[PDB]
Each structure stands twice: as C-alpha cells, then as structure tokens.
Design a binder for these strands. Structure first.
Length: 91
DNA sequence: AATAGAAGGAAGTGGG
DNA sequence: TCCCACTTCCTTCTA
C-alpha cells in the first residue's frame, strides 16, 4: 500500500482534488489543505487504504505529525500548511 | 459557549 | 519477535 506522503504528493501532481489541497510554494514543497474541503480528501485516503473506520482529517494529520521526526513532511507555522522534504520532492 | 487547528500519549492493526 | 506505517481513541491547549 501507498504511504500517506506519497498519496498527498500524487494528488498535488495530478490536480484531482484542487479544491482540497494546493501548493503554496511548490519549489519549496509547501502545501496547504482547504479548511472547508479537507475532509473529502481525508475520506479518500481512508478508502484507498481500506481502513475499517471512516478516515477524518484529524486522524490524517495525526499520522502527518509522525513524519516530523524523520523529515518527510514538516508542519509549517501557517494555517493547515505543511512542507515535503527535498528528498520526497526529488523521488 | 461554538468552532477550529494543532498536539501527542497510548494502544490497536497491517504486513512484513 | 518485534518493527513498519499508520489508525484509533482520548484529552489537552490555544485562538
């Protein structure tokens, strides 16, 4: 199965949920979720994973925070905004 | 109060 | 056995 950060990067490259997620500065790898439409994207993540329960944004962001230590995704001090690492961006 | 974003400890589930 | 990569649950704090 696909990793959460790759799922998000794939969405950003494809544009298929442009109303739920978008680049802020793609050169830097910063991206931002929609306040009003992020849940639809969280639902898709859960369904792609086949999880038992409905996925929520809160649980999705809980997983996102676990990347902070290893570095694939880091929280940015801006509403609903995160940043991929250069390594993730290159791959 | 109502709403929302952000946080993380702890325990459960998957597939190695 | 025991880590992977989250998922789920619950509670806290700030704005």
């Amino acid at each position: 199965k696909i990793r959460l950060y790759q799922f998000l990067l794939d969405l950003l490259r494809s544009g298929d949920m442009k109303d739920s997620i978008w680049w802020v500065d793609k050169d830097k790898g910063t991206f931002q979720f929609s306040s009003k439409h992020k849940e639809a994207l969280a639902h898709r993540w859960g369904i792609q994973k086949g999880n038992r329960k409905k996925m929520t944004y809160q649980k999705m962001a809980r997983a996102l925070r676990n990347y902070g230590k290893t570095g694939e995704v880091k929280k940015v001090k801006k509403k609903l905004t995160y940043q991929f690492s250069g390594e993730v961006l290159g791959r």
